[PDB]
Amino acid sequence: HLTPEEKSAVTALWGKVNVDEVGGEALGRLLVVYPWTQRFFESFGDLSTPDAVMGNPKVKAHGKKVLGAFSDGLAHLDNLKGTFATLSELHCDKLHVDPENFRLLGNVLVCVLAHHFGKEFTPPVQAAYQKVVAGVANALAHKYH
């Protein structure tokens, strides 16, 4: 549940987000900081070093897809459970990803947003985006519920 001011701030900050890079670096930083997550991305090639992860075209493209999913979730903040039903099926039944990794990736995305926005990212903006990422993770983890 986000107030109108929180929703306005979230949309305003998402308006200036680079959709071709931000998801890629969020996914790469997830792979680097939580290296057990590399077990789901074996077919992505070289992932041994941070430079190899952040220079990986497969990681860039998959992060672009993940960022698109996050944007779609942002456009339906009141229907997150229905927006992420197919992705929840994909991640739980076949991938077997643990729902805690969803929280980890959302927090990595928040850190990436802070790293770009800096002073413009503010503690209230962080609170709104933490609400958003918690909602997205809960919706994506529903098939475990």
Binding site: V32, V33, A114, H115
Partner: protein, 139 residues
């Protein structure tokens, strides 16, 4: 925990500089705003924006982290009294340590955009997780 991580952590925390208390106060404010369940550990505190009590507490937390950076090789002995306090006197849930570590990382990312490379991010995450592990070792 590797020596490369130790070097990266020392470099990042050194470039933090004398703003350590400001960073700690901002991280505490971020934690209070984002995770209000953590506010229950500070019932006697003024938890409004710009609060002097939060400023002093952030200074104390930042000084503790500076000591931890100075003693990364002897963290259990450096943070013994703090672990005893946080586990016996306060009985803090171990998840709030993760929450505060995340808010510290967000403050560092927002205030040192250049230094916050993926390698430095991983090193700082490992450092903060080790401080949290040490502080929760009395459980």
């Amino acid at each position: 925990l590797s020596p490369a991580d130790k070097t990266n952590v020392k470099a990042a925390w050194g470039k933090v500089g004398a703003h350590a208390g400001e960073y700690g106060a901002e991280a505490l404010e971020r934690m209070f705003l984002s995770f209000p369940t953590t506010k229950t550990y500070f019932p006697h505190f003024d938890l409004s924006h710009g609060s002097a009590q939060v400023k002093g507490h952030g200074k104390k937390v930042a000084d503790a982290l500076t000591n931890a950076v100075a003693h990364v090789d002897d963290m259990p002995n450096a943070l013994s009294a703090l672990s005893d306090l946080h586990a016996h006197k306060l009985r803090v849930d171990p998840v709030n340590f993760k929450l505060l570590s995340h808010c510290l990382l967000v403050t560092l990312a927002a205030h040192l955009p250049a230094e916050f490379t993926p390698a430095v991010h991983a090193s700082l995450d490992k450092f903060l997780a080790s401080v949290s592990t040490v502080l929760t070792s009395k459980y």
